[PDB]
């Protein structure tokens, strides 16, 4: 029940909200940031560039079946809503934890 922090940042169709992922792509304590550089010099052809953290970079292969998501500072895992918002949005990385907006 952490809908009081859930945004729908929609220049890049994300959901900026601090959760902590547990993925199988086996890992623990993953959180994501995303960029918005549409004027990126020589950096593939995409604006958004994920920068997956695992307390530092993972140095990234990828099937991203998330196993356990839990909201920071208010517990009781929000995994059903993460699957629901994963089902609605057909994009890479629905729940991103920060957005830079370059």
């Amino acid at each position: 029940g952490a809908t009081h922090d859930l945004v729908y940042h929609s220049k890049i169709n994300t959901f900026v909200w601090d959760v902590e992922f547990d993925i199988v792509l086996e890992l623990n304590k993953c959180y994501f940031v995303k960029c918005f550089n549409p004027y990126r010099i020589n950096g593939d052809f995409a604006v958004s560039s994920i920068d997956i953290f695992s307390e530092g970079k993972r140095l990234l292969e990828f099937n991203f079946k998330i196993t356990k998501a839990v909201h920071v500072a208010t517990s009781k895992d929000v995994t059903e809503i993460v699957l629901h918002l994963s089902e609605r949005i057909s994009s890479p990385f629905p729940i991103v934890k920060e957005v830079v907006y370059l």
């Binding site: 169709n13 960029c35 004027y39 950096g43 052809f45 990234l60 990828f62 370059l102």
Partner: protein, 628 residues
């Protein structure tokens, strides 16, 4: 409640029942003959009042005008930064109590709050006997202001110990019942009518009047209200800085300047963009200093995402250059050896971050950009500005200016320095963006395109196979080094890695399609078919831009619709293409989707449909710039 005194120096009359005495004053000021017919002492007094009203800018009344010019000039070394001159001015010996007062304010500005408190208390103790109690009264006020400053310093920074707990208990012992509201109403009879106008300095929320005047600049409005509010703004800054008041640093003032040039810039935006019908705010040095100092970084970003500041012209570029060279030089002295005064650090870093953010629009010079870029990359600390945001700031700086050779040499020195810090196999490369040093390489590959590194090539020639991260840092920055170096680390290659070297091309492998690797792409598509029968769009994009020459990707169409969307555009059904899928493409890729014929005919319909649905304007801006 006599004559209204206007913001341009003019005087109009109001509620004065009696002789026009200002009128006889200005008539005696104009003609010398009437000025002559007077006794000695009050002719000298007329010279004194004359010097006063020319010093405060108050000129002849509203009967005669046309040459109304307002050249604003804050002559204070605390406004222009000038920190090394400030310290220099501190260490001399005082001769007067006014010198004591300015030294107390200057020393208060540059992070030294204790000695300024003590010098304040010295002014209180050594001027109570002497008359004209303004310097005394202002010293008292400022002493309580710096007391609130210090207790704010133990309010926040303990949430390292800046001050010792002897001083922090002494002032808390002596200043913990301060009720300033009757301070002026305990001053003598002389100081209760002569300096009766200073009664707002025993309060803080005296900002009300010009704040409501800003709301005229809201309330929905030759000469406009802009020059009124701007000159009243400069009146405020010249007051709080030339009278050396410490209440300039509290939050209400930064609130006021913040919102003031917020609405001035928003109204210039609402002024030149009046061109519905027929078809401003020229920056000077003081506007640059105010934007750098009183705004924050996010707020200047907010002004850029609200008002087109690229339209806004800039003047006096050499003095702005002196402020930026001075601000970078003071960064250099801040981190040459030592001096990390945490107070002055927090202030000076906020100003330096904002000024270097706003320095994009400024036409810098050769050596200026040299000192700025050098102090930005080398000396400027971490934990506030990290290595990705130095590409934000740096690329922001190094786009408006045509890059000189020395700047590329300095950035090369930064890359060699980062390689010399990748000699330890624990170097984290922290980044709050996701931008990294490969983008620094991309910068040099953008503005030179033919740059061969020399000493980095020497590092790759003496490269040893015992430091993997070092090799990796030489391996992401691949298109910069010599051919023998290419033999050396291109020997250090693993070709079986399909989609690491892909997954984000993390090394810059887009330089070549080494043909076994594109056949590797093809056989990967065969493996896709294999693990079908009973990331990926990038492959499709690499077919879309005429890069991979094998066409049999049409056999692998049937799993990903976006794969069909870049491989076979004709036969793909343009009725279930999700639009989402377009807010994540580059300007070149959207330009080349716009460069087709059967693509555009359908995406105009779907994109216009999603624009037409509620209000989506990413689709409308792409629709008006790429697709049209």
């Amino acid at each position: 409640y006599d004559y209204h005194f206007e913001v341009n120096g003019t005087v109009v009359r109001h509620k004065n029942k009696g002789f026009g005495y200002m009128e006889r004053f200005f008539e005696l000021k104009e003609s010398c003959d009437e000025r002559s017919k007077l006794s000695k002492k009050q002719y000298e007094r007329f010279n004194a009042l004359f010097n006063f009203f020319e010093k405060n800018g108050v000129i002849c009344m509203a009967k005669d005008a046309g040459t109304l010019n307002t050249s604003i000039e804050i002559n204070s070394l605390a406004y222009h930064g000038k920190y090394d001159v400030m310290k220099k001015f501190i260490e001399e010996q005082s001769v007067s109590i006014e010198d004591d007062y300015k030294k107390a304010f200057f020393l208060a500005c540059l992070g030294r709050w204790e000695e300024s408190y003590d010098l304040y208390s010295n002014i209180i103790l050594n001027s109570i006997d002497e008359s004209n109690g303004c310097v005394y009264y202002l010293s008292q006020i400022n002493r309580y202001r710096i007391y609130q400053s210090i207790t704010q310093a133990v309010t926040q920074f303990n949430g390292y110990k800046p001050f010792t707990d002897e001083f922090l208990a002494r002032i808390e012992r002596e200043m913990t019942n301060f009720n300033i509201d009757d301070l002026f109403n305990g001053m003598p009879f002389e100081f209760q009518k002569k300096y009766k106008i200073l009664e707002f300095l025993s309060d803080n929320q005296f900002l009300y009047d010009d704040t409501v005047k800003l709301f005229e600049l809201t309330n929905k409005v030759g000469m406009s209200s802009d020059i009124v509010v701007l000159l009243r703004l400069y009146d405020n800054l010249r007051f709080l800085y030339e009278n050396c008041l410490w209440s300039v640093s509290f939050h209400e003032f930064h609130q006021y300047i913040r919102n003031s040039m917020s609405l001035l810039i928003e109204k210039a935006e609402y002024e030149r963009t009046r061109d519905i019908d027929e078809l401003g705010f020229f920056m000077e040095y003081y506007d640059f200093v105010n934007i750098s100092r009183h705004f924050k970084i996010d707020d200047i970003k907010n002004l850029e995402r609200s008002c087109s500041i690229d339209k806004i012209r800039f003047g006096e570029q050499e003095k702005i250059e002196e402020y930026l060279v001075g601000i970078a030089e003071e960064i250099t002295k801040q981190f040459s050896a030592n001096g990390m005064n945490v107070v002055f650090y927090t202030q000076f870093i906020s100003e330096a971050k904002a000024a270097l953010y706003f320095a994009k629009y400024v036409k810098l010079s050769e050596e200026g950009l040299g000192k700025i870029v050098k102090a930005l990359l080398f000396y400027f600390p971490e934990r506030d500005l990290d290595i990705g945001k130095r590409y934000v700031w740096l690329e922001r700086l190094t786009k408006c200016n045509e890059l000189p050779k020395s700047i590329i040499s300095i950035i090369d020195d930064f890359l060699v320095l980062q390689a010399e810090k990748h000699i330890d196999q624990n170097y984290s490369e922290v980044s709050s963006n996701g931008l990294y040093s490969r983008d620094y390489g991309a910068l040099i590959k953008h503005f030179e395109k033919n740059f061969i590194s020399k000493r980095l090539s020497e590092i790759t020639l003496c490269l040893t196979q015992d430091k993997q991260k070092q090799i990796d840092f030489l391996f992401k920055l691949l298109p910069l080094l010599s051919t023998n170096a290419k033999s050396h680390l291109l020997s250090f290659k693993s070709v079986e890695n399909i989609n690491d070297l892909m997954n984000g091309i993390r090394i810059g492998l887009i330089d070549e399609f080494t043909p076994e690797h594109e056949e590797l792409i093809i056989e990967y598509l065969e493996t896709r078919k294999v693990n079908y029968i009973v990331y990926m769009s990038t492959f499709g994009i690499w077919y879309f831009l005429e890069e991979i020459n094998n066409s049999k990707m049409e056999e692998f169409i049937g799993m990903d619709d976006q794969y069909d969307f870049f491989v076979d555009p004709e036969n793909f059904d343009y009725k279930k293409f999700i639009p989402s899928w377009l807010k994540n493409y580059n300007d070149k890729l959207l330009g080349k989707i716009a460069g087709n014929k059967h693509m555009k005919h359908h995406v105009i319909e779907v994109l216009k449909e999603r624009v037409k649905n509620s209000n989506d304007k990413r689709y409308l801006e792409i629709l008006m710039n790429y697709f049209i």
